[PDB]
Symmetry: D2
Subunit: 292 residues, 4 copies
């Protein structure tokens, strides 16, 4: 029952800031990077989530996230001894997934936009097959490009085409029915030796069971892979938080508004963080922010 979630947070162009700090624990303004893809799983209604990372960093992810009870969710943890490809998430997470459907998001993917929740909730309601995303961009060549028909059925996915068949690119967010476990087990490793998520998606494509949800004009997919990208991403979140006033990926807020934790739960977390900005945000959340 209930669709599960996996955040792939292991895995450098960011040297030396990633020499001793996991990329997905780097800050995006005022919160660790991983809070952002975690908020996406939570906004999609997922409460049973698996965190995957390296042997050095997984204990740190536990230090940050704990058992998930503070957010009314359950967090589990599994190590990925080596970065064997994105599809390896379904090998490492086989037991965790069980017979459930599952959403996979990359721990370094940061998205933001108006009317994003309705798209996530729809993707989370898939009955069978798989659902991937298509982010609209002016120059899609640096990415995996997803081509689809006028109804959302995917027809092709090409890696860095010099002649793109569409202007929609594939970010690291995927929703799957329970078939992905075995599909992942049977796919063939690349020549370089790695289980590619594209191979898993090509399989669903081949079966006419791959649909795409679009993140159109006005949606933002930030660049957390370069130093200028991270600075820009932090500046962007700071601006949005200041002008609209609400935090982006405050997991306590999402949990509370989803009814997964109580007002008293929020009050108590705020009390433990009294002299901090984050704590005052939680206190206001509990007080109601006027009309909410």
């Amino acid at each position: 029952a209930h669709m599960k979630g996996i955040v792939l947070a292991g895995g450098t162009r960011l040297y030396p800031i990633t020499r001793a700090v996991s990329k997905q624990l780097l800050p995006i303004y005022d919160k660790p990077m991983i809070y952002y893809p975690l908020s996406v799983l939570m906004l999609a209604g997922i409460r049973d989530i698996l965190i995957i990372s390296t042997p050095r960093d997984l204990p740190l992810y536990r230090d940050l996230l704990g058992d998930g009870s503070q957010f009314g969710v359950r967090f589990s943890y599994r190590v990925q001894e080596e970065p064997r490809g994105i599809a390896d998430a379904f090998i490492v997470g086989k037991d965790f997934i069980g017979d459930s459907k599952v959403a996979l998001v990359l721990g370094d993917n940061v998205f933001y936009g108006h009317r994003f929740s309705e798209i996530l909730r729809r993707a989370a309601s898939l009955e069978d097959g798989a659902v991937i995303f298509g982010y609209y961009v002016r120059d899609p060549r640096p990415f995996g490009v997803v081509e689809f028909d006028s109804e959302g059925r995917v027809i092709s996915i090409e890696e860095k085409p010099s002649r793109p068949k569409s202007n929609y690119v594939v970010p690291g967010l995927y929703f799957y029915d329970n078939q992905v476990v075995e599909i992942a087990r049977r796919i063939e490793p690349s020549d370089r030796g790695e289980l590619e998520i594209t191979s898993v998606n090509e399989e669903y494509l081949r079966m006419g069971k791959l649909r795409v949800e679009l993140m159109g004009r006005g949606m933002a997919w930030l660049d957390t892979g370069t130093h200028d990208g991270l600075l820009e991403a932090s500046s962007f979140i700071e601006t949005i938080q200041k002008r609209q006033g609400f935090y982006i990926a405050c997991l306590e807020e999402i949990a509370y508004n989803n009814g997964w934790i109580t007002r008293e739960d929020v009050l108590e977390m705020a009390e433990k963080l009294e002299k901090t900005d984050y704590g005052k945000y939680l206190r206001d959340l509990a007080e109601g922010n006027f009309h909410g």
Copy 2:
């Protein structure tokens, strides 16, 4: 009299931005790579409005005409009128009475910058009003610094309160308003406020008491940038820079909107790109004409 017209109010400001507005009209200040006024202009164009009146001070009007010309480059018509005295936002309908004629009209403040996914559908809906007025409510966590709009679940407006200590909603009123033709006579009848201005809030309050004021909400994820402080302008520029670098499309490239609306031709776009060949903006136009693959 046939099509809804538009007015961009781009006149006098206080000295809050002094000294950068001492010699540069606020609405000509840059927001990253384009003059501030391109942003609200893009909103009128996205709403389908092609007959637009630019109102500014006697000193600045010529500079706006230098920038915008007669509008033919964007497939629109620009008219210009001077606001001799800084009389208030509602004065736009007095200064613009002849331009408006018997048409419905949308007014946008020249310093208002909005952005968000699925904003066009909200604009086209507002532009389709049959009667009364349509204003906007921008969602914020702390609405106290603004005008606050209270409304029911169908968008009917109940009240508008300025800087309330006890806000009745978390939605604030920005500088974008759509009106039927009664707005001209309503503006002629409001009383100046205690601060000596013909307030747009007085116009909206008259539509409210007529039972004809509606509001369209701009929810979480939409951006209404701050162009009124130095820090706000800097943040606004950074926000535009990010969206443009990350998604690749420009925000408020008027040529782009005109072209995709069918208002100018591919040849028109190519010719503008040619006059600006060695510039970033020029290259964007060149790419637009080529199709940006499958843009």
Copy 3:
């Protein structure tokens, strides 16, 4: 007394420059031209000529007026068309008279510790000229200056593929009265341009060209691209917040130079009450504790 000239006339920034002069664009909280003007004032110069295009010159007049608000004097002269940087000495001949004169480009924004000391020294020249050398890792995109240990300039090349030094020449120059005649005599370029490089070469080949270095730690911002302007504004915002002092607040420079009175400052702050810039002026008159 040494005079000063700010060249602010003159596409890459289209469309923000279509109806707004580049040098009036903001750098965080002040018009771009305030930054090079503050350099002339920190060097002690009180008689300044502003040069711009026919279209933009009135806007500079609107901003700066006669200069009395800063205890200086501003004069204005039009440049019908961008005929070259050295043309400032043609257009400015009458303004210059028989005085020594410093020329700064209206789009040049500099910032760094111990900058006033080198401005004052350059402004104290007895004869010849003084230009600057800005330390950079890749000097290829600029005019590259080579000098000896006495600060004597020996060479200047334009965008060399094999630079002879890591110091580049920004738009800031100090000259003795000889520059007018020199600018009158230099030979135009293939594009009918009166290059400032031709002028500097003349002093070079006389052994009368000295250089002041803007070393590691000094910043010369990029005001010529959209990303550069955004970065420049961010930089000024950070420094003003962290050290607390404004960069290129002309009233402050005037008041501390004794060119205007505390009352003058309070008057300006009065007119700008409720504003950030106004409160800064109020504090300046109140003393900022020890100043």
Copy 4:
């Protein structure tokens, strides 16, 4: 030879949640870990024997980043500080490391930058006796410890957050001491909050007429790494300087190389390993001469 200590341990929760799983001094400042900045200051002062103090949980991460120091021609030693017992505790934890040497102490979260800063550091590092602290010029000194001094640099008083400041110069976390500092630290009394305060140490030197201050005037920068907005602005500041002047701030390999502590080949080997990264390309350009 004068030794150095970087105190990079426990912090408060002000930056929560970005410091929950990442030590504050490993957080990025644009393209390098925060600790590189104060480390660069010790190296520009000519110090090659450096002690890194941190919490038991984070010390291994600092060692992952820094190693034994040989890559920079320096020697890094590591000592634990179970809890932030006070800044002056650095001399108790580091007593054996210090031995009979003079020593410089810098806080791992202090980031300074400015034209002609090296000459100031070299002067402080050359003290014959007593102590040398710093005074950073600000328009409003009230939020800090304020240092009052005379024209030859003698310190008259240091007051914490005075409503009526005796100067516009504030005290940052950078201090140079003769060998008497260990005994002085041993004799100070714990403060009201149960901490061994560095201000107590400086006051002892002050009262003996043996405390001097070096000023960091207008044009010098002391960045704010204590708030989210401060970190964002600090990153933007480094990005600006690096893009506009071309040289990096706190590239330790560069400082080591120019000090003659490592060879051109050492730099080139590190650059080749990082050739696909911007940091690696900077090292290559430095060692291929950067023209001059």
